[PDB]
Design a protein around this nucleic acid. Structure first.
Lengths: 49, 100, 201, 48, 405
DNA sequence: CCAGGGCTGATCGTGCAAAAGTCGTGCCAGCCGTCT
DNA sequence: AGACGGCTGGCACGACTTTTGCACGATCAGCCCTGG
C-alpha cells in the first residue's frame, strides 16, 4: 500500500454530532463481534491463549 | 536456570562497582546518593545456537554473549543516605555463601 | 468484542426486575407469575384455540399434569424462558393499541381513567421508537473487550482473573454442559434444571 | 492531561516545539464506558 | 482387567495438569459435579520500543520521513539490532520510488537516539556509531577506528601479534587501544527490562516437624470429584425407563471414575512415604548423601509391582525445603563400593561437582587424576564414568578450562 | 405358605510378559606438552 | 620440529532396568420359578 494513509487511519476522530440509545437486536450483536468463544483463558506452559 | 550474585554485571563501568564487594553487596559505611548499585544480581537467558555472527561478539568481548541481564537492586529515585548493616538468608542445601 | 449463543433464549435482568415491570406492562401479567414462569415452577400456557382456557392464564405443575389428558395435545404450554418470548412475539402492537384506545374512549370512569392511559402511552412510545419487543431478551450475549479486564497478577503466577471472568467461565461451562446434554436427548427435568441454573448464572 | 493518548502526545510535542496548540480528540474513558454498556442488551452508536 | 481398568491406568501415568484437563473435559459429558476494581492496579510500562518512539515525535522530520522511521523501529529487536536488512525495508515499503539511501538517511539519524548504537546493522556498525560519538581527544581513536573498519576478523581469533604487521601499528601500544574497544559495551538494546516472571511445579509437599518429615499432598492441587446426591435419588422415580437407563449408566460411570481417582491419590501418597522412609538421608544432608533406589526395591516394599509404580512416578513433583524435584530424579543407578556396599550416582556427581569447584584453577585436573582421587577415597570407579558425569553437568572441557594464573 | 434351585444385574481384581533405554566400562581414534 | 606418552572424546559389548500394551472374563447376592 501507500503506507501513508494507513498510519493515519488509526486516528478515527472526526466528530460526534449526535448521541442516542436503543435496544440491542440479536442481528446487530453478531456485527460487532468478530468471533465466538472454551472456558480457558491462557495456559501456563507457553503463556499463550 | 538459577540466579546467582557475582558482581560482574556488564553495561556498567567500574565506577558504580567500586562500592561493591567480591560477592555483590556494598561495604558498610559507604554513602549512597540517588540510584546506585547495591546488590549485583543477574538473570540468565536462554541458550543460543552456533550463530557465528553472534559468536563473533561472544568470543571478542569475553563471556557475556547475552547470558546475563542487569537485574540489580536499582533503588528508587534520588535519596541520600548511608548503609548501617545488611542481612542475607539462604535455604538449606546451598553452598553459595561467598561472604555470609 | 465477542458473542455467546447460550443455546437458549434467556431473558435480561434489567427488565421485569426494576421499579416498573416493563415485561409486565406489555403482557399485562403480574410480577409474581412472570418470576414464577422463569424458574420452571409455573408452566404457563402459550396459546389455546379449542381448549377451554384463557390466553395468559396462570397454571401449575399438577394442573398441567392432570389436564394434559383432558384436552389432549392441543394445549401448548412452556415452562422455560421461551414462554415469555412466544407470548410477546404472538402479539400485534397496533391490534392491541386500537382496542386500548377504543376502551379508553368508550368507557370513561374513575378507575378507567387511570392505569389504562399509561399503557397506551407506553405502547405508542414503543411503536414510535422502532424497537421490537422480543428484543428485550438476549438470545445472543456479547462480551466486553478483554483489554479492559486484565489478568490481575497479585503475587507470582496469580492468573485467577477474579470478580470479572469467573462469571464468564461459569456461564461458558454451563452453556457447554447444557448443549452437550441437549445433543444426547437428556430427560426433561434435568435439562429444565440446567436451563434454570444457566438463567441464574 | 489524562485521556486522549494521542491528544496529550500532541500537546507535549507542541509545548516542546512552542506551538501551544491543543485538540479535543476523544476521552478514552468514554470509549471504555461505551464498550462496557454495549456488552449488555443496550445499543448505543455515534451517528452523524 | 477390561476397559474400566484400562482407562483407570492412563489416569495416573500423566501429570496433574493433563489429568485435570481430562477430568474437567469429561465432566461435561455426564452429570457429575466437580465443585480495588477490575484492573488490579494497572500500569503501562515504557520499554525500549516505546522509548524509541517517544524520541521520533520530538524530533523534526517530514511526513514521509516519519513513516520510514516508523517502519525502521518496528524492525528493532530486544537485542538492539534492526532485524531484517537495509534493502529489505525498501522492498517492504512497496514503493519503488523511494530510494535506498532515503532509508539510510533516516536510519543514519535514528541510530544516534537514546542508547546510541541502537538499531545497528550486523553487530559491527555498532562500534562505528558508538565510537564516532565521543570526542576525538581520546588517546587512540585513529587506531581503534582502523581496527574496527576492516580488521575484526583478525581480532576474532583473540590474537594481537598479527595486527602489527597487517595494518602498520606500533609495538603493543595498539593493545591498550584494543582495550578501548573492549569497553565499548555493545548491544545497547539489552538495557531491557529484567521482568522475567517466576515459575513453579508444586505437587506433593514434605515438612520436617519433630524429625522424620511427613509426606502429604497439596491441599489445592489435588482434585476432588464427588457425585451428585441430587440426581441420585431421581433414578427410581423415572418414567419412560429410557431415563432410568440413562441415569443408571451416568451413575455407574461416575462411581467408577471416583474410585479410580481416589485409587490414584492413595497410590501417590504410598509412593510418597516409601521414598521418605528410604531417603531421609537426602533430605537432611544433601545430594552427597543419597542412597540408590530402584523400581524393583520400591515395589518390594509394600505389596506393589514395578509396572504400577513406574507410571505413578512419571511427571510428579515434590516440594521440600531442599528444593523442588521430580520423583523420577530420586531413582538412579549404583556402583560397587568398598565393603560390598553400593554408592549412588548422584553422590559421585555431587562429589565431582565439589571437587572440580575446589580444584586449583591455575592448572586443571585431568579425568585420570580425578579417577585416582576417587579410588583413594574408596569409591572404585572407572575413568569413563567420571568422564560421563563431568560431561553430563554442562562441562564439555576438562583441560581447556584454563584461565590466567 | 416356605425353602430349594435357576436367572440375572451388580460388583470388581492395580498384574504380566515383551520390546526398548541406560549405564559400567573397555576399545580405539584425535590432540597437545616435552625431549630428542 | 616430530615421536612419545598423557589427555580427551566418540563408539560399542552387555547386563540391568524402564515401560507398555495387554487375554478378558469371573463372581456374588437379589429376584423369580417351583416342589414339599
Amino acid at each position: 500500500k501507500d503506507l501513508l494513509k494507513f498510519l493515519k487511519a488509526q486516528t478515527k476522530t472526526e466528530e460526534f454530532d449526535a448521541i442516542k440509545i436503543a435496544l440491542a437486536s440479536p442481528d446487530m450483536i453478531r456485527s460487532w463481534s468478530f468471533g465466538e468463544v472454551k472456558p480457558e483463558t491462557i495456559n501456563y506452559r507457553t503463556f499463550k491463549p | 536456570g538459577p540466579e546467582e550474585i557475582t558482581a560482574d554485571i556488564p553495561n556498567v563501568g567500574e565506577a558504580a562497582l567500586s562500592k561493591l564487594d567480591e560477592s555483590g553487596i556494598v561495604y558498610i559505611g559507604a554513602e549512597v546518593t540517588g540510584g546506585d548499585i547495591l546488590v549485583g544480581k543477574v538473570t540468565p537467558k536462554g541458550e543460543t545456537q552456533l550463530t557465528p555472527e553472534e559468536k563473533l561478539l561472544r568470543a571478542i568481548f569475553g563471556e557475556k554473549a547475552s547470558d546475563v541481564k542487569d537485574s540489580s537492586l536499582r533503588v528508587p529515585n534520588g535519596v541520600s543516605g548511608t548503609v548501617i548493616d545488611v542481612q542475607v538468608f539462604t535455604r538449606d542445601g546451598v553452598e553459595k555463601d561467598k561472604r555470609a | 468484542m465477542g458473542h455467546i449463543e447460550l443455546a437458549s433464549p434467556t431473558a435480561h435482568i434489567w427488565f421485569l426486575k426494576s421499579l416498573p415491570s416493563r415485561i409486565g406492562l406489555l403482557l399485562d401479567m403480574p410480577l409474581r407469575d412472570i418470576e414464577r414462569v422463569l424458574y420452571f415452577e409455573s408452566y404457563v400456557v402459550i396459546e389455546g384455540g379449542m381448549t377451554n382456557l384463557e390466553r395468559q392464564q396462570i397454571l401449575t405443575e399438577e394442573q398441567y399434569l392432570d389436564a394434559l389428558e383432558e384436552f389432549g395435545d392441543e394445549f401448548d404450554a412452556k415452562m422455560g424462558a421461551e414462554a415469555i418470548q412466544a407470548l410477546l412475539k404472538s402479539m400485534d402492537l397496533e391490534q392491541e393499541c386500537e382496542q386500548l384506545r377504543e376502551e379508553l374512549n368508550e368507557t370513561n370512569s374513575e378507575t378507567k381513567r387511570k392505569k389504562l392511559t399509561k399503557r397506551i402511552k407506553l405502547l405508542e412510545a414503543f411503536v414510535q421508537s422502532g424497537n421490537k419487543p422480543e428484543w428485550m431478551i438476549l438470545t445472543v450475549l456479547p462480551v466486553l473487550p478483554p483489554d479492559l479486564r486484565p489478568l490481575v497478577p497479585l503475587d507470582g503466577g496469580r492468573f485467577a482473573t477474579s470478580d470479572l471472568n469467573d462469571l464468564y467461565r461459569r456461564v461458558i461451562n454451563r452453556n457447554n454442559r447444557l448443549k452437550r446434554l441437549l445433543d444426547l436427548a437428556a430427560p426433561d427435568i434435568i435439562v429444565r434444571n440446567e436451563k434454570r441454573m444457566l438463567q441464574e448464572a | 492531561k489524562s485521556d486522549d493518548v494521542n491528544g496529550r502526545t500532541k500537546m507535549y510535542k507542541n509545548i516542546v516545539d512552542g506551538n501551544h496548540q491543543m485538540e479535543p480528540g476523544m476521552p478514552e474513558s468514554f470509549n471504555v464506558l461505551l464498550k462496557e454498556i454495549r456488552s449488555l442488551g443496550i445499543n448505543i452508536e455515534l451517528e452523524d | 482387567m477390561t476397559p474400566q481398568l484400562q482407562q483407570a491406568i492412563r489416569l495416573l501415568q500423566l501429570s496433574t495438569l493433563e489429568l485435570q484437563q481430562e477430568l474437567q473435559q469429561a465432566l461435561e459429558s455426564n452429570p457429575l459435579l466437580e465443585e480495588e476494581l477490575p484492573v488490579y492496579q494497572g500500569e503501562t510500562t515504557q520499554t525500549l520500543q516505546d522509548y524509541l518512539m517517544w524520541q521520533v515525535e520530538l524530533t523534526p522530520f517530514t511526513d514521509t520521513d516519519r513513516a520510514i522511521a516508523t517502519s525502521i523501529v518496528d524492525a528493532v529487536d530486544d537485542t538492539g539490532y534492526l532485524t531484517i536488512q537495509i534493502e529489505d525495508i525498501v522492498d517492504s515499503i512497496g514503493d519503488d520510488e523511494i530510494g535506498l539511501e532515503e532509508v539510510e538517511a533516516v536510519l543514519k539519524r535514528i541510530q544516534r537516539f537514546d542508547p546510541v548504537g541502537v538499531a545497528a546493522k550486523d553487530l559491527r556498525d555498532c562500534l562505528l556509531i558508538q565510537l564516532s560519538q565521543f570526542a576525538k581527544e581520546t588517546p587512540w581513536l585513529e587506531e581503534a577506528r582502523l581496527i574496527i573498519s576492516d580488521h575484526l576478523d583478525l581480532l576474532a581469533n583473540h590474537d594481537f601479534r598479527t595486527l602489527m604487521r597487517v595494518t602498520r601499528l606500533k609495538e603493543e601500544v595498539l593493545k591498550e587501544a584494543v582495550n578501548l574497544i573492549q569497553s565499548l559495551d555493545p548491544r545497547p538494546g539489552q538495557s531491557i527490562q529484567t521482568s522475567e516472571p517466576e515459575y513453579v511445579i508444586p505437587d506433593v509437599l514434605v515438612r520436617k516437624v519433630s524429625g522424620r518429615w511427613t509426606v502429604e499432598l497439596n491441599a489445592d492441587s489435588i482434585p476432588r470429584l464427588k457425585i451428585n446426591q441430587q440426581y441420585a435419588a431421581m433414578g427410581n422415580s423415572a418414567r419412560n425407563d429410557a431415563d432410568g437407563q440413562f441415569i443408571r449408566s451416568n451413575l455407574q460411570e461416575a462411581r467408577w471414575l471416583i474410585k479410580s481417582l481416589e485409587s490414584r491419590n492413595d497410590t501417590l501418597l504410598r509412593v510418597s512415604r516409601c521414598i521418605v522412609e528410604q531417603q531421609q538421608a537426602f533430605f537432611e544432608q544433601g545430594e552427597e548423601y543419597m542412597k540408590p533406589m530402584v523400581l524393583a526395591d520400591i515395589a518390594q516394599a509394600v505389596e506393589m509391582h514395578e509396572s504400577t509404580i513406574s507410571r505413578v512416578t512419571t511427571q510428579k513433583y515434590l516440594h521440600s525445603p531442599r528444593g523442588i524435584f521430580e520423583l523420577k530424579y530420586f531413582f538412579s543407578s549404583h556402583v560397587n563400593t568398598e565393603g560390598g556396599g553400593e554408592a549412588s550416582s548422584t553422590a559421585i556427581r555431587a562429589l565431582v561437582k565439589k571437587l572440580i569447584a575446589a580444584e586449583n584453577p591455575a592448572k586443571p585436573l585431568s579425568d585420570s587424576k580425578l579417577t585416582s582421587m576417587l579410588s583413594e577415597q574408596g569409591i572404585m570407579v572407572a575413568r569413563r564414568t567420571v568422564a560421563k558425569y563431568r560431561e553430563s553437568l554442562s562441562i564439555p572441557p576438562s583441560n581447556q578450562r584454563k584461565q590466567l594464573v
